[PDB]
Amino acid sequence: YKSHQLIKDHDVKWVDLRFTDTKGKQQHVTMPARDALDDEFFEAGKMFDGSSIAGWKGIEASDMILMPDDSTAVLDPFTEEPTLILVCDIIEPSTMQGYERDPRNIAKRAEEYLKSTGIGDTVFVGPEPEFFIFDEVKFKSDISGSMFKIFSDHEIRTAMCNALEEMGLVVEVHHHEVATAGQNEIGVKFNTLVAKADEVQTLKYCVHNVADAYGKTVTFMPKPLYGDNGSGMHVHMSISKDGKNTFAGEGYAGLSETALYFIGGIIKHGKALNGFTNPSTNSYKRLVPGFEAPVMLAYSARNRSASIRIPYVSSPKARRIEARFPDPAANPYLAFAALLMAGLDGIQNKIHPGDAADKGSLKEALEELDKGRAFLTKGGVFTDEFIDAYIELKSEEEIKVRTFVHPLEYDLYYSV
Amino acid sequence: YKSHQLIKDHDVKWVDLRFTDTKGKQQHVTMPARDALDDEFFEAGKMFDGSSIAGWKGIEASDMILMPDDSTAVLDPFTEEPTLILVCDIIEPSTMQGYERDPRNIAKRAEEYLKSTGIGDTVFVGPEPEFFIFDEVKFKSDISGSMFKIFDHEIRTAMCNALEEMGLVVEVHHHEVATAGQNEIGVKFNTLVAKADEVQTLKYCVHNVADAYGKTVTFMPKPLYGDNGSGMHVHMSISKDGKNTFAGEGYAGLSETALYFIGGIIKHGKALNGFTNPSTNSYKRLVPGFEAPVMLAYSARNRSASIRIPYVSSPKARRIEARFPDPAANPYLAFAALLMAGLDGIQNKIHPGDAADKGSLKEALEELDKGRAFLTKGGVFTDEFIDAYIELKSEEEIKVRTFVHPLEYDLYYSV
Amino acid sequence: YKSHQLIKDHDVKWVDLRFTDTKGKQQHVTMPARDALDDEFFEAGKMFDGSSIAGWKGIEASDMILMPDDSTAVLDPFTEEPTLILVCDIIEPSTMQGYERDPRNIAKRAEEYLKSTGIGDTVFVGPEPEFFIFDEVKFKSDISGSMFKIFDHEIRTAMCNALEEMGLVVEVHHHEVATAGQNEIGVKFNTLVAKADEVQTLKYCVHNVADAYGKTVTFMPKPLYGDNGSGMHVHMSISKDGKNTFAGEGYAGLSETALYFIGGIIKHGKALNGFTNPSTNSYKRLVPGFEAPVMLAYSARNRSASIRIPYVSSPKARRIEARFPDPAANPYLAFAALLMAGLDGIQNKIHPGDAADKGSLKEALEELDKGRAFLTKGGVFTDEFIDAYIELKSEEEIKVRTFVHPLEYDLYYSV
Known part of the structure; x- marks a missing residue:
């Protein structure tokens, strides 16, 4: 196991286990390093109680075990004292199976489903999340009023890149001022x-920590400012089978019929x-015309909309599909799994996407998903028991947002 | 003795003797280390007068001796000068036995009673205390009015380091699982x-470190009205010659002995x-709508x-968890009472019934006054001590019930 | 109708209709006096919607009418414009009868029941309320804390003048009998x-005059911990055809009817x-060592x-004084309940026993839940009304009980 070498070499004192919840926050728990030396730590996990977490409320979550994944062990740079960071999964103490409501388990099941189907052997994916940097921000909500206010450089960007390198990510490029100030x-x-x-979680964590250390603030929300561009997360994806780029082929822009069926399934779902x-x-504030955000539900090679x-790409080895609509707020595991399953359904049904293009709301999306749930449960990757709770959470948030009264209403109607 | 060795190694100057009173506060005294070098110190104790303490008022407390327990000797991390720390018991100068009103003596007598009964050889218990951390707190009471007002790996790791230095074995450090500051x-x-x-030392260490860092820390069962309270789950089991007597077959692998334990605890x-x-404050926590238990029953899944x-992975780790206790309880007395209830259940083979599936302080005191029978069983407790304890606890109930509170002004001032 | 002559004499502009809710607060509405001139005003009342009031949340209360009582017409002293004040009763539009939950209707029904029973003819009642006067008061309750703080012939004469102008008959004015501010x-x-x-009018007058002079006045039973509370002594008597039925030969010159009345009061x-x-708050007043009574008995000399x-100097003035009631009580319901208890005592000839010589709101509510019998007797009270009242009071008691108070911080913060 990789953790033993790091512990012995750098006399680590504390071990930090981390795991993402349903909403996407990375909860963590600390313990001394003494009990991590014996292999029993990796053979049996550690006791845990997740009943308090938003998406896991219920009797079932009253007893759980955290199982570390030694493949992800690293050392913490920020801590003044040596610390070993590990990611973990949730295992049901009764059945020794990955918990139904665990996004990481869902992603692993999606990978296993693809492998069993045999359409390909592996899948490669790369996201491109944007973010905003500000000097100060305030916001408050109360039964008597609501307010939000915003107050607004190689050094900071270099520090961010250095921190990411020290984590162990392979940075490639850094952008700034590309579209608007602060992005x-x-x-x-x-x-x-x-x-x-x-890796996306680590990216977000390090960005937040560095921005805080430099006295600034950083946000990933899809659209913080009304009159400016939104923050997107494009996703590049491809499937590989024994080293062959299954998407690479002859046709429109060199796509194969497999890739075209993938696109057709994505379009359908x-x-x-x-x-x-x-x-x-917030996402549907971004998703509007008159801006860089996409509008038409279509595929192309040139059309920006x-x-x-x-x-x-210079070589067929690099043929990939790019999806534009996703947002940084999306949970990585669930978003990637949903995209993969939609593409696989499209491939299996050989749904022709049609001619290449040339020359909503959260409530509506939830309603559509509730009835379109069929394909997600295909192969047992997703389950209705999980989809229902997810829908309840999002519906509660939507109701809360919709029922509130907003300041613009006073301007529009107070005098009438 | 361990103390001789420690003093010789670290040229200690001062010795601290500590003991818990009836209410649950660690009183202590100090001596120069010069006197502790004599074995007669451990063979005879030191004169003491505890008549001033709340629960010990009377003729007897005017003359007592403190007997140190060498097994607990440790070194103080905080004191600038080297200091030794020891726990002590109270022995009556007339007849060399523990004073009737000593919770530690009560706990030892409970252990002896279990050993004599022979249902088991030893008992293992682990509590889970909980606490809140705040930045600033104010409170005041007077005839003219009353008021109360309330207002991060580094600190948690400092607490863990202090506990390890004092000699405990930490296992995990939770943080804001349910609400901020918990x-x-x-x-x-x-x-x-x-x-x-160990619980006493843990409380002392946490308080000291939180103070040193400029914060405040409290163990009250429920400091805030709108948030969850602070409980203390208690896990326990009984061992007989290396055998987990509770381990067995049945509901969740429980033995009939364990089931009778549950029945006795349920009855009492x-x-x-x-x-x-x-x-x-405990009965502010013990209300519906929160994580606190509500129904007096036993179940392996129903969290209510x-x-x-x-x-548990192995039968060796089979244990029983009680949820209702709170941090404010005196450790010795709470553990002794739980053990006695379980032992009575076992003795009478009280069947607990089907597993569940799908009050006030004055009332509790009244119930205890009548149910005192089992506690005095075996002579571990005494009716004298029970009466003194009930009388002492009655004052706080009366004072709280008779005082006037600000919410009353809001509710009735204009009426 | 007296309203016509009053309006003609003083060119009244507005008429203010007043009534009382279940909790005892006086709600009111206003309208131009122009409308009230025709007799149809008194014959048909005016449409009203009481659905929002606490005790009348039932669906039926969404459509009611107000019947003014010409006997209570008066002129408002305070208003700069001429204003005429009237009291009103709640009538069910469908049945043209008094609403089941109107305290005034309940009192009228109790009077009618007494008259029909033939035991007596009329009841004479004198209450003796008290109040406290302060310079300033502040209070606040929030998730983050709580607080409450408290900080001559002119004013007393002004209050007497206001009462006389509103038409009451002042007799005596005691100030600082035993403590400051009472x-x-x-x-x-x-x-x-x-x-x-008249009690409601007196409360209104006192509040208005105190506000005008810039001080504050409260009727709450127990505003300060260390000082005597405020109570209502109720003198009561029954007269039949001009004869004081209570007068007679016996202990302190009471009749057997009066003795049975007292026995019924004691029992209930x-x-x-x-x-x-x-x-x-009243149960804070009801404690030993202060003005409040303790023993549930009757005596002519024992103050407890x-x-x-x-x-008294004449049999005509023979009366019975009840000491326990407090100003917070709703006058209509309190008087009706006392009368009903006394009537039951007389009807059952319950002997009170020998004269004495030489709890909590939860308990009271649960006891009232069982004591419905003698109240529902005669049909004056209704089980629906009793249930709604108990629900309101229980909700209030729960709110008060399930809360944290500053005294708890002083007691248990470090424990």
């Missing part, structure tokens, strides 16, 4: 589904996917 | 008396609140039950 | 319903607390008895 994006090398999903790729009321793009 | 620290379980001493539960929840059986 | 004004006795209305005292002490026989 930034850091490129990173692609990877397999689960590993990339894990696009409306339902918004429940996972845009799980916030299409939601699916075929990037140009 | 924390808990797991610790390796042990026997009854040792675990009680109402009386136990006088020891496990000895504060008016007051007794639970956590899953 | 005052009482005596007023002539009268019949039940009229006296009940526990249930009466639900109406004579409907506030948690809850029932007293005042010494």
